[PDB]
Design a protein around this nucleic acid. Structure first.
Ligand SMILES: [Zn+2]
Ligand SMILES: [Zn+2]
Ligand SMILES: [Zn+2]
Lengths: 78, 104, 585, 187, 187
RNA sequence: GCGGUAGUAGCAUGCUAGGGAGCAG
RNA sequence: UGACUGCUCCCUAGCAUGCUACUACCG
């Protein structure tokens, strides 16, 4: 339902973050792997929507890499 | 993530709240301290002296569960190998798979 | 690997194997291209080759597809069907095929040396995309032939200004260093930074553009990338816009120009326009005009080189804010004066080399001459603007047509931008006779530019003319002109103010040698981009073929302001020209 | 089926043996004709089975080809696709914290670290313009990721410590607006 | 089939029978018209069913012999790669400090675990945290395995050069911690 | 009237090899 | 970077057997 839609968006969020060569900083890849392994083992949709803000904020703090504007005006959340 | 299969399953009444069938098998990721932390589980192997008068009898009741078979040495032309395209170890995975060394 | 046969507009997945660019051909081009022209090779998602230990019969001739692979005749596991049969070649899209009525496109262009007149003239009567592919094949043939040349090297470091260089032995070696040699060095087994070197003079004298550190064994060879496919046409249909709606006009209007509001309204109610402009014909000061009059308009400015951009940037920061320009630098001659690494502005300049694609509204480029349709296509695909005002001239400083073997074609028959104009007519009226004098304008508008410019400013009776035939004496590898440079020097001594000019010549070695006893800076002829000066010494030769063939340098005469010096040995450009005639002493 | 070169033998002989019973003849003629029908019938039920196998075989090789060509365009476009997948999936969740840090980081308010979940939890974002500051924070209170933080320090481009009283659609045009606001979580 | 030695009989028997159809053939010559291309045709088919078997057999040794060649060429490329190793890992034995323990040995046999421990020139220490660092590798020199080693480089997990002043008690939270110290032997 | 013999085409079974994929300890 | 075994489904190539029609000689 809602706990299975968060558990599949955190598999696509650590693949976008693994294709951007975030594996080359082993002080931040060690936190992203702990916020993704912890969401998958969660048993409440109120304590897995707050590790999805920490994990998503890693992608929005990486500047140029992902064009957020283009990707949001691409028939998606406006 | 196979999103088509998940969409199809959800559109057929699956993964509802309070269901008997949930997702519990995943692909778990690991960091760079994973191989050494798994090797270090060899600290559970401690030297162990056995009871020899008891083990010398157990080993004789155990070799009776293996009496209906046959065995022996075989020549190099009777050996059966499946999937010759699998690794060949250290000092060698640098030059080929098991096929190279079974052919050379 | 599913491209497109744009020889038919057909969507296919094959390509000619032993061909120039390996382009996408359908089942009806790749059927007849192989039988007549020996391109017995096709490339698909998997190459059409034998698939059995040792085979060397790779000709999609009678190859039979069976058992999930392409077998052969000689050894026959035939039990299948041939690859080429019933006017088609096997592959995907084997049903949705159209065909072409012009069979001998590859049969004529994929075998020749891409330099014959017939190929060019039939190219200039093709469509836009076929000619885009023809221009990409011209770039591709240039780059393919770029790796069939020589290599320089240094194995012995000597004292400065006296080195030695050997290129190669027994192979067919002239090159007007136009694009200079930056190879990379080697010391033992790896690559070592060396920099960029320039070889002009040449034991063998060596000049220095910048300080460097020679090492033993350093090689020099050029590597050039492959031009990527583009997705935009070159020209656009004529379609007048509804109104000038959607713009932000300004209350103030210039008053030193008497042809400004008319042309502003014209570009307001016109979509695309092309002209024939010599140097100093609005490229100097009208760009600032449209900049100030149209503020909100996203005007993009680019040249083929940063040095023609410098011409407008020098004074583009006095009257207007400094931040009004923005160019990127790579990590070609440039200089870090502006604010670099800033690709966001209202008047974002541009470069032919590379620039990110964000937005644009007005097309205005400087001289676009030294390139084929490639430049128009790369600038139309890089950014698509609402209005097009093509400044410059299609025939101003044309790109040298690599290896010439059969004369030179008539300018009238250029790629796309010269015959259209002189078959439909001029679109706009524009002229800047402020810098240029009339002595040049009269003849230049008499030859090709009839009734386009007016004789505004007079002449101070300074132009130098002396009919001298001279004697030419060629050698095994070069030739030096005795008479004409000597008489030029003798004429220069008769005026006291003649030692503040430059030393420009058709050949770099000639002026370099002649400067060792006069003391003048070395200069060459590649493109006098946005660089106008008063005094100049002009020369030619070898006329007959290299200099006296066509008016390759008619527009280029307009650099001076009160007079120029241009001797000529023929009787075709002085029949009515009135350069002051005088006799030798 | 038809159009096969060996088809004008199972037509003539088929028509002949056929009509042959109305007119009729000796048994010899009938046997002769049947021993031409079968002689030129095998030639048809052999060239229309080999074709029957080639026509389906062809439609298999030209299907592995369709797989080796879609599976090389599915792999060369990975990057462009998983970023579209993620944002198609992020809209459907319709969360409130997730739909705030996304809208905020589209106008400019991106963070400079990970969003911490603790109670001290220092944060650093970059407000680019005055309107984004006015909407987000008023006073010493800051709203972000559906949580409330308390501003502890404001810093302009280099090290310019802005006091909260001098950022007000006024003194504001006089600074380098990409600020670096530091805050701590609340409770 | 143009060189099978049984084409002559077949060709002639066809000509005799087939070509002589228009000419009036009695019921006695018809046997020759029939039982002359027959038998000959049977033999030809026999001469073609053996040729087809000889061809396939032949094209099963001109494929199994490319594979015996391939493998020997390969056997010579690995036999020359292990040789180029066992002669490059040998020019690296400081044969003054190695011939000094094989000599003090009773018979010349020594444990292998004491060869890198007593005859090596470089030491690599991998350190998890800061507490372990000050009890193992403090200062520019340290003693280990009854020797004295002097530090030469301290890279980290990312492989970026660290200096011996970034390693504080409180700067430690700011380093990729598996730290690798490379030291050289002294005296 | 039937049987045997040698080729040819067509339909299923088992076995021997190669290739891709799924599960288990 | 990709271990050792066992089972099992699908596709292609080759070998032998099993009821038929076609050939042709032979009875
Ligand atoms: Zn070709
Ligand atoms: Zn085509
Ligand atoms: Zn073959």
């Amino acid at each position: 339902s809602k706990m299975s839609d968060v558990k599949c968006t955190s598999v696509v969020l650590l693949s976008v973050l693994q294709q951007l060569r975030v594996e080359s900083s082993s002080k931040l890849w060690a936190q992203c792997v702990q916020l993704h392994n912890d969401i998958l083992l969660a048993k409440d949709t109120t304590e897995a929507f707050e590790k999805m803000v920490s994990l998503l904020s890693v992608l929005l703090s990486m500047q140029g890499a992902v064009d957020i504007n283009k990707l949001c005006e691409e028939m998606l959340d406006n | 993530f196979n999103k088509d299969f998940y969409d199809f399953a959800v559109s057929k009444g699956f993964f509802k709240e309070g269901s008997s069938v949930e997702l519990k098998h995943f692909f778990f990721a690991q960091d760079g301290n994973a191989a050494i932390s798994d090797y270090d589980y060899y600290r559970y192997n401690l030297p162990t002296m056995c009871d020899i008068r008891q083990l010398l009898f157990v080993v004789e009741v155990v070799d009776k569960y293996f009496d209906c078979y046959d065995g022996g040495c075989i020549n190099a032309n009777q050996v059966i190998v499946n999937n010759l395209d699998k690794s060949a170890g250290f000092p060698f995975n640098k030059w080929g798979k098991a096929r190279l060394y079974y052919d050379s | 690997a599913v491209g497109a046969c744009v020889l038919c507009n057909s969507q296919t997945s094959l390509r000619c194997g032993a061909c120039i660019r390996r382009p996408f051909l359908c089942c009806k081009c790749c059927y007849d291209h192989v039988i007549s022209t020996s391109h017995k090779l096709v490339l698909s998602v998997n190459p059409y080759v034998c698939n059995a230990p040792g085979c060397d019969v790779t000709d999609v001739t009678q190859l039979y597809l069976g058992g999930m692979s392409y077998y052969c005749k000689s050894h026959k596991p035939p039990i299948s069907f041939p690859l080429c049969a019933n006017g088609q070649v096997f592959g995907l899209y084997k049903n949705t095929c159209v065909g072409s009525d012009n069979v001998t496109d590859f049969n004529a262009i994929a075998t020749c040396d891409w330099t014959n007149a017939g190929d060019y003239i039939l190219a200039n009567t093709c469509t836009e995309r076929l000619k885009l592919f023809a221009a990409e094949t011209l770039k591709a043939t240039e780059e393919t032939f770029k790796l069939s040349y020589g290599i320089a090297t240094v194995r012995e470091v000597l004292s400065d200004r006296e080195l030695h260089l050997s290129w190669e032995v027994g192979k067919p070696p002239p090159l007007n260093r136009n694009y200079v040699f930056t190879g990379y060095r080697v010391t033992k087994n790896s690559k070592v930074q060396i920099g960029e070197y320039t070889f002009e003079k040449g034991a063998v004298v060596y000049r220095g553009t910048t300080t460097y550190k020679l090492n033993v064994g350093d090689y020099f060879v050029l590597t050039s990338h492959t031009v990527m496919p583009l997705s935009a046409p070159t020209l656009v249909p004529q379609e007048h816009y509804v109104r000038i709606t959607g713009l932000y006009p300004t209350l103030n209007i210039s008053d030193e120009f008497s042809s400004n509001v008319a042309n502003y309204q014209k570009v307001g109610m016109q979509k695309y326009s092309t002209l024939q402009g010599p140097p100093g014909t609005g490229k100097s000061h009208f760009a600032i005009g449209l900049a100030l009059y149209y503020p909100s308009a996203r005007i993009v400015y680019t040249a083929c080189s940063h040095a023609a951009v410098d011409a407008l940037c020098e004074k583009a920061l006095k009257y207007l804010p400094i931040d009004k320009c923005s160019r990127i630098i790579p990590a070609v001659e440039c200089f870090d004066k502006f604010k670099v690494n800033s690709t966001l502005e209202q008047y974002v300049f541009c470069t032919v080399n590379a620039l990110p694609e964000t937005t644009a509204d007005i097309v205005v480029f400087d001289e676009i001459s030294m390139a084929t349709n490639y430049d128009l296509s790369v600038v139309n695909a890089r950014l698509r603007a609402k209005h097009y005002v093509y400044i410059g001239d299609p025939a101003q400083l044309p790109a040298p047509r690599t290896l010439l073997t059969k004369g030179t074609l008539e300018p009238e028959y250029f790629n796309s931008v010269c015959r259209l104009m002189k078959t439909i007519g001029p679109d706009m009226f524009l002229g800047t006779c402020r810098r240029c004098p009339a002595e040049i304008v009269d003849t230049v508008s008499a030859l090709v530019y009839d009734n386009k410019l007016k004789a505004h400013k007079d002449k101070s009776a300074q132009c130098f003319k002396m009919f001298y035939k001279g004697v030419i004496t060629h050698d095994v590898s070069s030739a030096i002109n005795r008479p004409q440079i000597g008489v030029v020097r003798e004429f220069l001594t008769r005026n006291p103010a003649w030692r503040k000019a430059v030393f420009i010549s058709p050949y770099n070695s000639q002026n370099a040698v002649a400067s060792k006893i006069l003391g003048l800076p070395t200069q060459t002829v590649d493109s006098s981009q946005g660089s106008e000066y008063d005094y100049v010494i002009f020369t030619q030769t070898t006329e007959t073929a290299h200099s006296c063939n066509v008016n390759r340098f008619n527009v280029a005469i307009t650099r001076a302001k009160v007079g120029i010096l241009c001797i000529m040995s023929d009787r075709d450009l002085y029949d009515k020209l009135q350069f002051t005639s005088l006799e030798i002493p | 089926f038809s159009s096969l070169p060996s088809y004008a033998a199972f037509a003539t002989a088929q028509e002949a043996y056929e009509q042959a019973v109305a007119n009729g003849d000796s048994e010899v003629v009938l046997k002769k004709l049947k021993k031409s029908l079968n002689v030129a019938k095998s030639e048809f039920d052999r060239d229309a089975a080999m074709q029957r196998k080639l026509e389906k075989m062809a439609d298999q090789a030209m299907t592995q080809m369709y797989k080796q060509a879609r599976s090389e365009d599915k792999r060369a476009k990975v990057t462009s696709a998983m970023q579209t997948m993620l944002f198609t999936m992020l809209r459907k969740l319709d969360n409130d914290a997730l739909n705030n840090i996304i809208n905020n980081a589209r106008d400019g308010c991106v963070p400079l670290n990970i969003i911490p979940l603790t109670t001290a939890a220092k944060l650093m974002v970059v407000i680019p313009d005055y309107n984004t500051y006015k909407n987000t924070c008023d006073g010493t209170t800051f709203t972000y990721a559906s949580a409330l933080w308390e501003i502890q320090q404001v810093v302009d481009a280099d090290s310019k410590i802005v006091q909260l009283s001098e950022i007000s659609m006024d003194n504001s045009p006089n600074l380098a607006w990409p600020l670096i606001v530091t805050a701590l979580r609340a409770n």
